Design an enzyme around this catalytic site. Sequence first.
Site, short mmCIF file in Angstrom:
data_model
loop_
_atom_site.label_atom_id
_atom_site.label_comp_id
_atom_site.label_asym_id
_atom_site.label_seq_id
_atom_site.Cartn_x
_atom_site.Cartn_y
_atom_site.Cartn_z
N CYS A 110 1.28 3.88 4.66
CA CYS A 110 0.22 5.58 4.84
C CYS A 110 0.44 5.92 6.41
CB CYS A 110 -0.70 5.48 4.24
SG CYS A 110 -1.78 4.24 4.09
N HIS A 127 -5.48 10.55 5.68
CA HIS A 127 -5.76 10.20 7.23
C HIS A 127 -5.76 11.22 8.49
CE1 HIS A 127 -3.88 6.00 6.23
NE2 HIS A 127 -5.61 6.16 5.38
N1 11C Z 1 -2.03 1.59 6.14
C1 11C Z 1 -3.00 0.97 5.23
C2 11C Z 1 -3.33 0.38 4.20
C3 11C Z 1 -1.12 0.68 4.32
C4 11C Z 1 -1.01 -1.26 3.97
C5 11C Z 1 0.86 -0.88 3.90
O1 11C Z 1 1.88 -0.45 3.97
O2 11C Z 1 1.21 -1.49 5.29
C6 11C Z 1 -4.81 1.04 5.02
O3 11C Z 1 -4.64 2.69 5.47
O4 11C Z 1 -5.93 -0.29 4.75
#
Ligand code: 11C
Lengths: 357, 357
Positions: B127, B251
Amino acid sequence: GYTVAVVGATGAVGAQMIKMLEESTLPIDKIRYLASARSAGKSLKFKDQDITIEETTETAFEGVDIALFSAGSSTSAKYAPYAVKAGVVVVDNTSYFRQNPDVPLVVPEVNAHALDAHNGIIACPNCSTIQMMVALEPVRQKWGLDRIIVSTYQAVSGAGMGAILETQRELREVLNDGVKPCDLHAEILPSGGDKKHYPIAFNALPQIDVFTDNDYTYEEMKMTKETKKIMEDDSIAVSATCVRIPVLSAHSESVYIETKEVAPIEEVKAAIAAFPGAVLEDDVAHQIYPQAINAVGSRDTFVGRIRKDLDAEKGIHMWVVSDNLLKGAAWNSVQIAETLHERGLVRPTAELKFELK
Amino acid sequence: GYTVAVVGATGAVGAQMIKMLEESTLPIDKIRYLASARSAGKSLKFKDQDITIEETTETAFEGVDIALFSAGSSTSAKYAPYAVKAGVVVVDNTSYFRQNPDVPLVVPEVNAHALDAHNGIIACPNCSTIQMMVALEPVRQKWGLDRIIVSTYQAVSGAGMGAILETQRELREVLNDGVKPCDLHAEILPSGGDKKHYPIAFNALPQIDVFTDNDYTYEEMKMTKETKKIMEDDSIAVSATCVRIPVLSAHSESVYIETKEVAPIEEVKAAIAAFPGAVLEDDVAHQIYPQAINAVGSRDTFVGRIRKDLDAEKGIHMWVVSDNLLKGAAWNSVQIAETLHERGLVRPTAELKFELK
Ligand SMILES: N[C@H](CCCC(=O)O)C(=O)O
Ligand SMILES: Nc1ncnc2c1ncn2[C@@H]1O[C@H](COP(=O)(O)O)[C@@H](O)[C@H]1OP(=O)(O)O
Ligand SMILES: Nc1ncnc2c1ncn2[C@@H]1O[C@H](COP(=O)(O)O)[C@@H](O)[C@H]1OP(=O)(O)O
Ligand SMILES: N[C@H](CCCC(=O)O)C(=O)O
Ligand code: NA
């Protein structure tokens, strides 16, 4: 002993200035609390004694040895020159006198030597700047500094007491009343003086202070300009992004640096650990790194996540956290006053170099 | 039409996968919801219809045309190859298959061409990676990319439904019960799988996922490695610092780049605004910049605070925000499925290229 005055005693920093002075080694015979007319007459504590808040005026500084200012740059501009005229040594926690060549901009662990030639005013740097300087100076001393790129994660208490209350209220409205964060009403943040206001609850606001002509904010530019003065090196490249997050106390910083010479990481960790005011919290095997909640209440600056850039030979990343009301403001100011005492620099200044407004 | 399966339908991403599919143009004849044993038997809505949640098994994919996975890496490792064997086309929102040369790692606006030679699995990138790719691709196309330095401000929904609830609970305990942040008990964050757990309320945690043997976390290293694969250029230098902050959704990222050729900021702004999936929110005179709270619920990626470095000729700083459950996960996956439909790419793969566990 000394007569010590606290200008802006009722504020967020002022409250911590009282706490730091209570815990200080400074020989204080008389303590005085100063604020605006609306606070005058109220009672506030010093240890267990009762002190009556006074209104800050041009004639209120007679007989004062040391004055700690944290009442906004407008109050310092108006009353600090009169304090110097009255024979006071001023430690100023605002941005007003910081870039004046007659004013030392001091972090005691980095440039205490600058205090010696003071002309009645010592400027305490910006909170976001101070903790970075504590972390980076030991690195600069051994391997030099070419450039700094920093992204900040700043607490709301930096904007004052009102900002804290706004943050707490907003978060309560979302969690208790079910209000959508984007529907909240804000009065202060990102900047009290700016035209528009945005919620901070469950948000990250990439604006601290107002914008300058170059599309960086004053906060970002202060980090640039203050670093150069403190480290006495205009050749250090500094670019910053300053962001407010939903933290009440303690700033966090993602700091990238490029050194002049390659700095071995274990030697960097050791140099930072050995530097006064800096504490190494870096043990990734046991998930040890600086945290805002752990830094609250401590005078120390905490450094971790130290690692070399994946590509740049002289590039190093790190994570820097410190209480923004302590080392970022109130403790730095009291520590300056303690250093002034050490060096016998608490005395009237003959030549008045600051125009009375 | 298609029979579509959602693996991990009950989770934080799964709920958004449902919504995105409900608002999709995809010709869906049948919807099936798959999860673990503990959700099996329960019912969830698809529009007005009641859908019985099924337990995910190696035999649960007969007749399924498209399966969207978001049930953790282990679930994809176990069941996705059996789906491919059955004749399904899998869109996978885990890290498990991302660095497999037989698997396209796709952001449709950036590398849709990679879909054509798929072998039954298309990986949705991390993400935090996706939104950066949307912002930077229009810049890369015109001026190239030499390096990226990124510090992230990531929402807790990325760590799943439990992390959201933990965050809300902690904040409620502090704000309503008067509990001190230090005294909070955490069970999931920063990383559910890791040994130690820390409070996120009024905190900033410089750990997402587990640490790797180079002292960067797996989240930081995924941003590095996924960027290189998506942009099909291993020479792009990428180093990241990934931090969790008290935000539920969306984010935010402070992104520093150095281009190959000097990229005029006004042209950079225009290039981003013209790029599909990217929206320019950059008007500092009116305090306009991307905000997490504004991005929630939107498929778009928002870019602002665009400005050249103060010293580096080819250096540019920016602020990138997107809903981590939408473009970061559910919408990207659904968009992949829609692009697969557009290109006639929804059909069984004859040769199995993936191990049955
Ligand atoms: N981005 C991570 C979750 C997603 C983990 C991934 O798809 O490799 C988080 O914010 O905790
Ligand atoms: N004109 C002024 N003279 C002296 N103190 C001032 C003046 N204006 C504001 N202050 C003080 O500056 C501080 C601001 O802190 P904060 O940003 O945390 O509220 C307060 O203590 C406030 O005192 P007062 O309580 O009298 O307004
Ligand atoms: N072994 C498994 N097989 C299928 N789905 C699983 C398995 N383990 C976890 N899941 C699913 O992954 C998702 C995780 O979501 P989140 O990260 O938001 O908690 C949930 O939908 C969960 O379903 P369940 O609800 O049955 O546990
Ligand atoms: N750093 C500011 C407050 C201190 C302003 C200054 O002394 O230049 C903030 O966090 O909002
Ligand atoms: Na030390």
